[PDB]
Amino acid sequence: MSKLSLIQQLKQQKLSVGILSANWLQLNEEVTTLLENQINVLHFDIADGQFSSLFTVGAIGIKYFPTHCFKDVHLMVRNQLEVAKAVVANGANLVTLQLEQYHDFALTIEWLAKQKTTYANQVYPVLIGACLCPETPISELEPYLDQIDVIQLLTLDPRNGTKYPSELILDRVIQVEKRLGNRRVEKLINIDGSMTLELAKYFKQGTHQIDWLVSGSALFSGELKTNLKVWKSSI
Amino acid sequence: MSKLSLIQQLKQQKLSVGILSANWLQLNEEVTTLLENQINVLHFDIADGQFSSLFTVGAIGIKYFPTHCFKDVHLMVRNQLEVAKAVVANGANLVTLQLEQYHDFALTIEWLAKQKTTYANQVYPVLIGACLCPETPISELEPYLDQIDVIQLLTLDPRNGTKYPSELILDRVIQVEKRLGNRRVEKLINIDGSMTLELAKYFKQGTHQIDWLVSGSALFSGELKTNLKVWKSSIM
Numbered sequence: 001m002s003k004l005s006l007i008q009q010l011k012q013q014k015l016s017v018g019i020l021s022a023n024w025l026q027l028n029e030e031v032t033t034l035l036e037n038q039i040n041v042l043h044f045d046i047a048d049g050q051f052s053s054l055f056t057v058g059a060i061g062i063k064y065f066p067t068h069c070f071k072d073v074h075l076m077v078r079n080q081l082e083v084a085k086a087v088v089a090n091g092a093n094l095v096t097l098q099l100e101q102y103h104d105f106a107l108t109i110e111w112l113a114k115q116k117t118t119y120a121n122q123v124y125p126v127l128i129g130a131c132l133c134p135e136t137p138i139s140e141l142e143p144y145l146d147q148i149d150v151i152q153l154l155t156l157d158p159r160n161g162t163k164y165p166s167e168l169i170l171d172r173v174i175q176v177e178k179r180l181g182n183r184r185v186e187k188l189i190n191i192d193g194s195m196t197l198e199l200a201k202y203f204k205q206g207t208h209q210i211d212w213l214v215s216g217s218a219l220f221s222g223e224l225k226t227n228l229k230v231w232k233s234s235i
Numbered sequence: 236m237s238k239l240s241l242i243q244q245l246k247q248q249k250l251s252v253g254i255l256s257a258n259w260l261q262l263n264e265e266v267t268t269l270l271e272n273q274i275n276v277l278h279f280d281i282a283d284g285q286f287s288s289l290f291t292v293g294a295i296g297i298k299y300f301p302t303h304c305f306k307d308v309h310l311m312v313r314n315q316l317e318v319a320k321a322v323v324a325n326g327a328n329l330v331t332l333q334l335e336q337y338h339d340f341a342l343t344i345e346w347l348a349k350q351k352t353t354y355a356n357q358v359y360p361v362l363i364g365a366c367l368c369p370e371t372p373i374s375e376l377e378p379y380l381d382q383i384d385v386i387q388l389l390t391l392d393p394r395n396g397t398k399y400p401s402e403l404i405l406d407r408v409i410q411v412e413k414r415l416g417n418r419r420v421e422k423l424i425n426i427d428g429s430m431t432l433e434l435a436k437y438f439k440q441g442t443h444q445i446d447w448l449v450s451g452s453a454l455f456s457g458e459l460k461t462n463l464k465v466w467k468s469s470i471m
């Protein structure tokens with residue numbers, strides 16, 4: 001199966017859930033609740049305290065989640081190649097790098113391009129993502145746009161904790177869409193960073209196609225089931 | 236209870252369980268099983284991919300475990316001071332530093348020495364550990380022996396692919412013991428790294444008191460309940 005076929009299938013899903021935002025003693029039930037609600041995309045922030053102060057989990061974090069879940073693995077690390085190998089080895093289906101981490105960006109996307117993993121009950125190439133912090137110019141994507149599958153836009157800069165204006169983020173979505181042209185159908189444009197129902201509604205009211213929004217602590221502030229009912233009702 | 240009395244009580248346990256070696260979707264069942272078995276010491280390897288290539292989990296890893304468990308938090312990181320603050324905030328009861336992290340070791344134990352935490356329903360000082368990779372000279376511990384509570388010896392170096400004979404680790408326990416003298420009673424001397432039943436039997440094969448063995452993947456290779464039955468019948 002090709003990347004393109006997979007990408008079109010994924011667009012059926014609207015939420016990449018940051019599952020480790022849950023209580024780690026309730027992970028099985030949380031994932032069960034997600035599956036019961038036709039959600040199977042799980043986001044992981046793999047962060048080493050080197051890109052930002054953010055020091056979260058390594059590859060081990062993604063390991064025990066079922067292979068019938070799509071593992072959207074977001075790296076914010078110093079050693080992107082090494083960490084990419086580790087997450088691919090633990091079943092990552094998408095590996096997203098930080099564009100700002102330029103020292104091994106190209107090398108890592110080169111290695112990723114040759115990897116395959118299994119999703120659901122089939123073998124696919126691993127999807128490759130590029131994430132940009134809010135001030136990183138969309139213009140810096142140009143050398144890689146053809147090669148990447150996912151463009152992820154952060155709402156905030158983890159390197160300072162600063163949350164950026166939602167209108168800026170929507171503008172950036174437009175700038176990305178423009179550059180993709182007729183190849184827009186070949187990519188996911190996703191938004192990540194301290195997602196709230198208010199941001200979610202603003203981005204989806206925005207008349208420009210966003211594929212996935214990534215959930216954070218807000219989904220798990222209160223019962224997941226409750227919050228899912230709102231997501232499903234409101235957005 | 237003082238720090239010393241806590242240390243004596245802690246010595247009643249023989250195993251510090253590497254809980255995140257479990258299947259993460261089963262963490263609650265696994266913690267329940269340990270508690271049912273009179274085991275409540277949980278070991279966490281907080282590793283940032285910088286001290287070595289080992290990159291496990293940050294402070295969030297300890298957060299959701301019950302405060303009635305004793306959290307034995309082993310740092311293998313570049314910025315020890317910063318991580319120590321983060322793990323203490325998430326309830327660390329013991330913070331073990333790498334002696335090889337020379338740049339902030341003393342500073343971090345200085346900070347740790349001012350900290351207090353909750354174990355059971357009582358406030359204690361945070362216990363302080365020093366961990367050595369196998370090739371690090373025991374003599375380098377000398378300046379800190381009175382400031383630390385726990386000496387942890389690794390059976391392996393995560394920065395290496397070297398296979399270190401187990402006999403050398405027991406030799407190192409003797410080197411620590413000899414330096415401590417009558418202070419030994421005040422400390423835990425613990426062994427960590429790829430622990431197996433065989434290795435446990437060897438280390439426990441006496442003469443030289445070892446307080447905790449830290450468990451890893453072996454404890455969760457097969458059913459936890461089964462492996463605990465095995466551990467208790469062999470060693471306990």
Ligand SMILES: [Ca+2]
Nearest residue numbers: 220221222223
């Ligand atoms: Ca919650």
Ligand SMILES: [Ca+2]
Nearest residue numbers: 455456457458
């Ligand atoms: Ca197992």
Ligand code: NI
Nearest residue numbers: 044045074192
């Ligand atoms: Ni993310």
Ligand code: NI
Nearest residue numbers: 279280309427
């Ligand atoms: Ni350890």
